[PDB]
Every structure is written in C-alpha cells, then in structure tokens.
Amino acid sequence: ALPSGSDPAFSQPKSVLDAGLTCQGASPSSVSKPILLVPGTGTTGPQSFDSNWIPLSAQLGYTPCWISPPPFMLNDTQVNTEYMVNAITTLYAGSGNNKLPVLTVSQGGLVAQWGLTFFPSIRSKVDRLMAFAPDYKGTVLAGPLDALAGSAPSVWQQTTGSALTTALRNAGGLTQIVPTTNLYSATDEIVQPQVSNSPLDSSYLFNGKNVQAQAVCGPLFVIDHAGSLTSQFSYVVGRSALRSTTGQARSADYGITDCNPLPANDLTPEQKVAAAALLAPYYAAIVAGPKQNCEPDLMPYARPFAVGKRTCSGIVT
C-alpha cells in the first residue's frame, strides 16, 4: 500500500518552484524529449550534471532539464521535493502529455522516491527512474565533524533513523513505484551501509533493478560516491536503463568489460577533469554551509508515518 488521494499542497508558491526549473535550450512549457536531472546534497543542478549527464543525455537525444532547490539542496528535503513534483507536472504537459525519465544522484534519488510516495499525481507521468547512489535509508556515516555545530536540514533528514527516512520506509516507499534502477557501490564514502547487496543497503528498492558495482565487477572493485554517477560503468548502466523497454537497466546490456570507474569515455578531456571535482561544492557546503540544531518537522502528509521520532517541534505523537 502507498499514499493515495490528492497531492498535498505545496508550501512554496508555484512561481518560486517554477523559478528552480531550467531546460537546456528549451522552455519547460515546450520541450522535446525532456529528462529531469535532480542533483545531490550541497550542489545545484548544473554542478551535478554539467560534467556528466547533461552532455551524456543530450547525446542520447534528450533535452537536459534540471532543478536547483535553494540553497544547494541543503534545505528541508520535503521542500526540495516540491521542486521535482512541480517540474514533472510542467515537463509532462510541456512535452505533449508524455512521460519523462528522471535521473538523480545522492539526495536526488531520495527526493524522487519521496515525491512518488506522497504525490500520487506524478506516478503516471514518470516512465522510469535512474538513481545513482540514492540514500533511501539515509546514511550511517556522520558528517566530517558535524556533531558540535549542527548540520543542514537535509543532512539531518539523511541521517539513518531520521524521522524522514523512517516515514518513507513506513509509508511503503522502499518498494519501487515506477521502473527504478539503483546504481551504487560498497565503497561509497558518503552513503552507507551499501555492502550487503541486499535490502540492507541504503540504495536498495524492492522490485527495482539494484546494481551494486561489486556484484557486477567483483568484490575488490572500488568506485566512490562521485564515480557512482560519472563512471563509464555508470554510463553503461544508466544508458541501458534509459533505452530499455521495461524501464529498468538490462543485465545483457552491461558486463565485466564495462567495469571502468573513471569518468565516461564519451566525455571530453575537460569534462572528465570537471567530473572528478564533482563533490567540491558539497565539501564546501558541509563545512561552511547553513546549519540547524534539529531535524525539520514532518509535513502533515508524512507525519503519521514516523511516530516516536523527534524533530524540531518535539516527538511526532
């Protein structure tokens, strides 16, 4: 079972949410073959995909579109999802009422499944989801000394055992809602645990196409968080998920010969070097970005699914 009924109301005006959506070389209301790219924590849309999937999806025939929820995905994850839901509705109608793919990284995958869980209207508008290193269960790795100064709202909510991650799980959000592919690695230095190749991993979704790099490439295969998005292996897996008639990556489309953790071969030399510096804005955000001293309160639609957890207002019930 999943949440049903009308979409919850947005807490932000539509002009604010519309302001966060951009398409490369096209208007959101008139776009050909759009793809929604959702960035990770501590970054904007261009910062996550300029070096990788904005050019890679454009070469595959898509119009790169993205959201950049302020500030740098560090604010309340529930509010970042409003940008995605509004963008999908806009891009669905903007492309002649046709389904569009969604490709994410880091918190972006958590944002995608959160929207599909609690905003039922977009379930018939997303044809597939290609999530790179998503943290559906949050992460057990604390911030690089983010325990005496607090952390960003989105960092609170991405901690294992948070009210947000609890509510997503309890609402049935750990089962895929659209055809979903999850590409992750046991060597992820930001999102853990990922070492079980099982529902214990943070990126695992039941009935999804869960691709742990070590399961395909070997137990000693190393590929970090940024590589999980930009690698040639990730391109092969992602390109398979986008081309597939089932909506999921196909095991026949990739193999041990594609196990390259370096940036995708099709990227230009400037793009590969830029892809290696993917987390540079993320590093700045965790050390010098906004911080608060409690996990943001749950919105009314998600509050009933995390009874017992403490947020800024107190205990849910």
Measured between alpha carbons, how far is 196 from 163 in angstroms, rounded to an integer? 24
Measured between alpha carbons, how far is 46 from 109 in angstroms, rounded to an integer? 16
Measured between alpha carbons, how far is 122 from 113 in angstroms, rounded to an integer? 11
Answer whether 155's CB lies under 8 Å from 74's CB. yes
> For residue 168, how many C-alpha atoms fall within 13 Å in the half-sphere facing its CB?
30
The closest of 53, 76, 129, 105 to 282, measured between CA atoms, is: 105
To one decimal place, what's the resolution in Å?
A: 1.9
Q: In CATH, what number is assigned to the domain containing residue 217?
A: 3.40.50.1820
Task: Please tell me the experimental approach by which this structure was elucidated.
Answer: X-ray
Of the listed 188, 201, 203, 234, which one is catalytic?
188
Measured between alpha carbons, how far is 182 from 204 in angstroms, rounded to an integer? 7
The closest of 100, 7, 127, 22 to 65, measured between CA atoms, is: 22
> For residue 235, how many C-alpha atoms fall within 13 Å in the half-sphere facing its CB?
25
- Domain of 128? 1-317
Of the listed 48, 51, 95, 106, which one is catalytic?
106
Instruction: Note if the bond before 39 is cis, omega within 30 degrees.
Output: no
- Give me the amino acid identity at 191: V
Answer whether 203's CB lies under 8 Å from 135's CB. yes
Instruction: Clarify whether 253 is annotated catalytic.
Output: no
The closest of 166, 137, 132, 167 to 57, measured between CA atoms, is: 132
Instruction: Clarify whether 225 is annotated catalytic.
Output: yes
- Give me the amino acid identity at 75: N
Instruction: Clarify whether 18 is annotated catalytic.
Output: no
Measured between alpha carbons, how far is 130 from 211 in angstroms, rounded to an integer? 11
Say how many residues make up the chain: 317
Q: For CA atoms 255, 259, 265, 266, give the dihedral sign.
A: positive
Measured between alpha carbons, how far is 222 from 227 in angstroms, rounded to an integer? 9
Q: Give the number of other Cβ atoms within 10 Å of residue 165's Cβ.
A: 26
The total domain count for the chain is: 1
Measured between alpha carbons, how far is 90 from 55 in angstroms, rounded to an integer? 22
Of the listed 162, 203, 225, 240, which one is catalytic?
225
The DSSP secondary structure of the chain, one letter per residue, reads ----SSPPPPSS-HHHHHHTEEETTBBTTB-SSEEEEE--TT--HHHHHTTTHHHHHHHTT-EEEEE--TTTT-S-HHHHHHHHHHHHHHHHHHTTS--EEEEEETHHHHHHHHHHHH-GGGGGTEEEEEEES--TT-BSS--TT-SSS-B-HHHHHTBTT-HHHHHHHHTTTTB-SS-EEEEE-TT-SSS----SSSTTSTT--BTSEEEEHHHHH-TT----TTHHHHBHHHHHHHHHHHH-TTSS--GGG--GGG---SBPTTS-HHHHHHHHTTTHHHHHHHHHS--BSSPPPPPTTTGGG-TT-EETTEE--
Please give the biggest Cα pair distance in the chain: 54
